[PDB]
Amino acid sequence: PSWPQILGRLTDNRDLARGQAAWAMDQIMTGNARPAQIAAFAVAMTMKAPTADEVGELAGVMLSHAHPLPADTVPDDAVDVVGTGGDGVNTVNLSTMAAIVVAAAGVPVVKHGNRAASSLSGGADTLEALGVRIDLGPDLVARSLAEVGIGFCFAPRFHPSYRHAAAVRREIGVPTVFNLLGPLTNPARPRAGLIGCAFADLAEVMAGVFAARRSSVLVVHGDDGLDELTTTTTSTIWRVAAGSVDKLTFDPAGFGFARAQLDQLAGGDAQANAAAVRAVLGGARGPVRDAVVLNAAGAIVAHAGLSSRAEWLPAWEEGLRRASAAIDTGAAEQLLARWVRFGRQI
Ligand SMILES: COc1cccc2c1cc(C(=O)O)c1c(C(=O)O)cc3c(c12)OCO3
Ligand SMILES: COc1cccc2c1cc(C(=O)O)c1c(C(=O)O)cc3c(c12)OCO3
Ligand SMILES: O=P(O)(O)OC[C@H]1O[C@H](OP(=O)(O)OP(=O)(O)O)[C@H](O)[C@@H]1O
Ligand SMILES: [Mg+2]
Ligand SMILES: [Mg+2]
Predict the structure, then answer these.
(1) Nearest to 265 by CA among 239, 294, 299, 298
(2) Residue of the nearest CA to atom 8 in ligand 3?
(3) What domains can you pick out in the chain, each with its CATH number?
């Protein structure tokens, strides 16, 4: 296999042969690819229309190189709440806030995350500003998960070999298939997730990757563009269970949610977004709480889907009760405090 062969096949608008995407990602991850080759590959794959098989190969290589968590430290029902980013909206950190709430409801959360790429403050940035340790290695993440109920896998800590691809990703500015890989490469490999995708035309492919792994995942794209379940309008959900993908449209109005405006969800710097987390966890009502509860509920629905018995509407009703209760009882607020204390005590 070679760069001219793979790039030629992609530029000819052909799906790659089995193993080719994997070979390429492996070249990229082993420092053997020129930035020009990485960029050509990312761009060519994106414009060809990536297949689930191809993206799966990419994510598989990354996982094969990632730092794993210690044996038997991640429960079978752990969940992730993470998105591609790239929605261009600069919101409050909805996935991060939802993840705290989900963990406080008693669902084990191992969240994959990163700093901002285009937004003013990404999940990792806001967590850091809240006093949460984002730098923990495999052993200490496993401990955070066991002791606090949530661990955060900072992508750079667990995927050091991806630095070459990351550089190119940042240099070229344009979203590509690489923008899908974060949510697909949680090194703890949780089997459930609420997974945001900013790119409507790539969400189905993301869902196919999770389907191949037999994860229970809702891949979500707000019809306003959010890489989250939105409250401003409907969201498209690619529902993954039992190895197949179902496309659904989701309407919060069905659950008594009032329509919000996008600017009601707007974010600021790390300090402002940290303040927004504190506000929601302290019981402040309004648009941000609503979107947090909705997304927390969706992650709980993904978790419910790990069972073959799971029913969609009962799961949403239970997810919503559980997310609201986790905030209202103070569990979410306390969990954050305990998470901060945990990190200060290593
Ligand atoms: C130094 O910057 C980094 C170090 C290690 C990893 C990553 C990284 C940057 C990005 C990124 O550019 O956002 C990134 C992304 C992404 O969303 O592109 C996805 C990933 C990553 C990384 O590893 C897991 O899957
Ligand atoms: C928590 O409840 C769930 C979580 C995740 C997925 C599903 C789900 C429930 C149902 C369901 O309505 O029994 C469901 C159905 C269905 O049987 O209509 C079909 C699917 C699904 C799901 O994902 C792939 O295609
Ligand atoms: O700068 P952007 O490309 O727009 O990305 C914004 C954040 O979105 C993704 O994280 P994540 O979904 O984990 O959560 P946060 O905003 O939602 O809570 C990404 O890793 C960034 O941290
Ligand atoms: Mg998000
Ligand atoms: Mg977002």
Answers:
(1) 294
(2) 85
(3) 1-66 (1.20.970.10), 75-346 (3.40.1030.10)
